[PDB]
Motif scaffolding. Structure first.
Motif, mmCIF file in Angstrom:
data_model
loop_
_atom_site.group_PDB
_atom_site.id
_atom_site.type_symbol
_atom_site.label_atom_id
_atom_site.label_comp_id
_atom_site.label_asym_id
_atom_site.label_seq_id
_atom_site.Cartn_x
_atom_site.Cartn_y
_atom_site.Cartn_z
ATOM 1 N N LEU A 291 21.810 47.793 -33.264
ATOM 2 C CA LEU A 291 21.160 47.195 -34.410
ATOM 3 C C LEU A 291 21.144 45.680 -34.272
ATOM 4 O O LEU A 291 21.892 45.119 -33.465
ATOM 5 C CB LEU A 291 21.898 47.598 -35.698
ATOM 6 N N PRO A 292 20.275 44.994 -35.007
ATOM 7 C CA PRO A 292 20.375 43.542 -35.078
ATOM 8 C C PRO A 292 21.689 43.134 -35.712
ATOM 9 O O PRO A 292 22.262 43.889 -36.519
ATOM 10 C CB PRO A 292 19.177 43.157 -35.959
ATOM 11 N N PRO A 293 22.214 41.939 -35.375
ATOM 12 C CA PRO A 293 23.635 41.645 -35.668
ATOM 13 C C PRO A 293 24.003 41.577 -37.141
ATOM 14 O O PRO A 293 25.086 42.038 -37.519
ATOM 15 C CB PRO A 293 23.844 40.292 -34.978
ATOM 16 N N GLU A 294 23.121 41.043 -37.991
ATOM 17 C CA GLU A 294 23.383 41.060 -39.430
ATOM 18 C C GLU A 294 23.313 42.477 -39.986
ATOM 19 O O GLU A 294 24.182 42.890 -40.770
ATOM 20 C CB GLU A 294 22.386 40.148 -40.142
ATOM 21 N N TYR A 295 22.303 43.244 -39.574
ATOM 22 C CA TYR A 295 22.205 44.639 -39.972
ATOM 23 C C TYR A 295 23.327 45.472 -39.374
ATOM 24 O O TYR A 295 23.792 46.419 -40.008
ATOM 25 C CB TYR A 295 20.857 45.205 -39.566
ATOM 26 N N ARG B 14 30.290 47.568 -42.089
ATOM 27 C CA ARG B 14 31.032 47.511 -43.345
ATOM 28 C C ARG B 14 30.851 48.788 -44.158
ATOM 29 O O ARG B 14 31.811 49.309 -44.731
ATOM 30 C CB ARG B 14 30.577 46.283 -44.128
ATOM 31 N N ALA B 15 29.637 49.337 -44.173
ATOM 32 C CA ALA B 15 29.404 50.566 -44.914
ATOM 33 C C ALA B 15 30.018 51.786 -44.229
ATOM 34 O O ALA B 15 30.364 52.756 -44.907
ATOM 35 C CB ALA B 15 27.912 50.774 -45.131
ATOM 36 N N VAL B 16 30.139 51.771 -42.902
ATOM 37 C CA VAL B 16 30.775 52.886 -42.204
ATOM 38 C C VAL B 16 32.279 52.851 -42.435
ATOM 39 O O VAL B 16 32.891 53.866 -42.783
ATOM 40 C CB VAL B 16 30.432 52.858 -40.702
ATOM 41 N N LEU C 193 26.528 55.049 -47.938
ATOM 42 C CA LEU C 193 25.942 54.715 -46.610
ATOM 43 C C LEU C 193 24.862 55.740 -46.268
ATOM 44 O O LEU C 193 23.844 55.344 -45.678
ATOM 45 C CB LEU C 193 27.042 54.756 -45.554
ATOM 46 N N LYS C 194 25.064 57.005 -46.642
ATOM 47 C CA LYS C 194 24.103 58.060 -46.230
ATOM 48 C C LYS C 194 22.712 57.712 -46.761
ATOM 49 O O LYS C 194 21.757 57.773 -45.972
ATOM 50 C CB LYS C 194 24.565 59.401 -46.799
ATOM 51 N N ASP C 195 22.609 57.309 -48.026
ATOM 52 C CA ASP C 195 21.302 56.894 -48.604
ATOM 53 C C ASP C 195 20.807 55.622 -47.906
ATOM 54 O O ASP C 195 19.604 55.555 -47.599
ATOM 55 C CB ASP C 195 21.449 56.629 -50.101
ATOM 56 N N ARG C 196 21.690 54.637 -47.708
ATOM 57 C CA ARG C 196 21.273 53.322 -47.143
ATOM 58 C C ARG C 196 20.660 53.467 -45.751
ATOM 59 O O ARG C 196 19.447 53.210 -45.615
ATOM 60 C CB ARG C 196 22.488 52.414 -46.939
#
Lengths: 56, 145
Positions: free
Chosen positions: B12-16, B22-24, B31-34
């Motif tokens: 992924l891109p570094p900010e994403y 963080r969500a994992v 996280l599943k929805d995001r």
């Protein structure tokens, strides 16, 4: 790309050209001359013929 | 029956990547929805959607072979799967030259022996098909022309 020796189109520097005769719908006899300049393709097809020539 | 699991790596891109990390590590199902990952019927193109923001993806082939190894005691490790593909997000284009680790960079170009690769057999099969559907075939090894 990392510098490497560039091989010639084979040791002989020879490309492969194939003439194909086919019949079109209704009545026609077109001939299609196709030239292959890639040794990778050359080597496999010639080996297949030379083999089929021994089968004959 | 049992089907071998298919693991791949998602870049992924570094900010994403920081938001997904963080969500994992949080661990909620929020996280599943995001985070989502669309796969297109090309097979080598996709969207990964982080927080409903679309990112363009390509499934590429990795030059080395990785293997996931699980453990229970950290002394004996059992191989679980083989990883060879990466869905980087932001044919020749679908081949990745570098490896994942830092020492492996430009591995395909420099640290790989150039074993001849021939793909090429499929083109020869197509040529044989054009042959068998013809009537008369004329061949000559040629010179410069």
């Amino acid at each position: 790309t990392a510098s490497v020796t560039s091989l010639n189109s084979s040791a002989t520097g020879r490309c492969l050209k194939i003439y194909r005769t086919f019949r079109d719908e209704e009545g026609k006899e077109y001939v299609r001359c196709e030239t292959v300049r890639k040794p990778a393709v050359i080597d496999a097809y010639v080996r297949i013929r030379t083999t089929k020539d021994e089968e004959f | 029956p049992h089907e071998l699991e298919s693991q791949f790596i998602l870049r992924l891109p570094p900010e994403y990547a920081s938001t997904v990390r963080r969500a994992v590590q949080s661990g909620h199902v929020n996280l599943k929805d995001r985070l989502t990952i669309e796969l297109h019927p090309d097979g080598r193109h996709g969207i990964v959607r982080v927080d409903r923001v679309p990112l363009a993806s390509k499934l590429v082939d990795l030059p080395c072979v990785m293997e996931s190894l699980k453990t229970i005691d950290k002394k004996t490790f059992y191989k679980t799967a083989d990883i060879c593909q990466m869905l980087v997000s932001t044919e020749k284009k679908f081949i990745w030259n570098h490896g994942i680790t830092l020492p492996l960079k430009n591995v395909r170009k420099r640290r790989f022996r150039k074993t001849a690769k021939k793909d090429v057999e499929k083109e020869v099969k197509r040529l044989l098909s054009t042959d068998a559907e013809a009537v008369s075939t004329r061949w000559e090894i040629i010179a410069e022309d």
